[PDB]
Amino acid sequence: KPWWEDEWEVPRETLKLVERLGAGQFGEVWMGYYNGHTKVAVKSLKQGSMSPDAFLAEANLMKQLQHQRLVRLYAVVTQEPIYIITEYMENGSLVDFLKTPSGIKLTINKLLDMAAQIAEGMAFIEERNYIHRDLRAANILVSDTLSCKIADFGLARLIEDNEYTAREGAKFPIKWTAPEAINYGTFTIKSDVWSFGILLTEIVTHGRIPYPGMTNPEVIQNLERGYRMVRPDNCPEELYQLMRLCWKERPEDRPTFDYLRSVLEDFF
């Protein structure tokens, strides 16, 4: 099928990829320019590491799950080497942006609005009957207008295994993962709600790492004891209490992203 019949497919020629943001054991991620006028992020598949159709499976969801609060698919190149292209965000990821001087200037009101947007897109993902699995500030992109786009960069499969590790379990961010996911490998949307609560502490603490003063092993040990993160300084007790709802022990007792979105929106 001709590429101009499609809304996504573009001739590889339209792409001048310039910098290698991050390569792994399934392909690289470059920054480059589409027809010279737009800068874009380009995910490429390396041959052999996986099915061409398995790579495209992602691109395909992105077509189907378009939404203002999701990172929007920009273009795709199907032939090998395969590219998935989105647009580049000069503000970067939420966790990065928060630590910038302009990020640190953000008001609690603006922070809460971004949280609301993140909840909003998660609510859409829930509504479309998917989950995220790695919902945290590192997979959130900040737009030019300072709104938040939910991304999934495949952060986990992006790290190369070393001589010292041989886990054949699951891969997940210890400090963001609900205990039922840690213990029983059961990841659900309610599992993402947990992550969202931890994400909230990142938002309200300039992108600070969760569970300050605890190693990932320590974190898991304390989770077994029912331990919950301490309310970040200056973080409003009400917001914290909202976090505590995201960290209910039983996943079904945790709010929905709709409720989260709602509470967040009319918070002030």
Ligand X SMILES: Cc1ccc(NC(=O)c2ccc(CN3CCN(C)CC3)cc2)cc1Nc1nccc(-c2cccnc2)n1
Between CA 124 and CA 119 the distance in angstroms is: 9
Candidate residues 27, 86, 121, 191; the one interacting with ligand X per rule CB under 6 A = 86
Q: Could you give the count of Cα atoms lying within 13 Å of 267 in the half-sphere of its Cβ?
A: 24
Stretch binding ligand X (CB under 6 A), from 82-90, 99-107, 162-170, 252-260: 82-90
- Give yes or no for residue 30 binding ligand X (CB under 6 A): no
Known catalytic residue: 258?
no
* Residue sitting closest to ligand X (CB): 41
Question: Which residues are CB-neighbours of 231 under 8 A, at least 6 positions away?
Answer: 237, 240, 243
263 is in an annotated binding site: no
| Beta carbon of residue 97, minimum distance to ligand X (angstroms, whole number) | 10
Provide the residue type at 20 as one letter: R
Q: Which residue carries 């490998």 as its tokens? A: 185
Provide the residue type at 136 as one letter: R
Q: Which residue carries 């505590």 as its tokens? A: 244
Stretch binding ligand X (CB under 6 A), from 57-65, 178-186, 228-236, 250-258: 57-65
C-beta separation of 106 from 166 below 8 A: no
Token pair listed for 73 = 């698919």
- Give yes or no for residue 77 binding ligand X (CB under 6 A): no
Could you say which of 134, 233, 253, 266 is catalytic?
Answer: 134
- Give yes or no for residue 152 binding ligand X (CB under 6 A): yes
Q: Which residues pair with 185 in a beta bridge?
A: none
21 is in an annotated binding site: yes
Length of the chain: 268
Just list the catalytic residues. Answer: 134
Residues that bind ligand X (CB under 6 A): 29, 41-43, 58, 61-62, 65, 70-71, 84, 86, 88-89, 92, 130-133, 141, 151-153
Which residues define the annotated binding site for ATP?
21-29, 43
Binding-site members are 21-29, 43
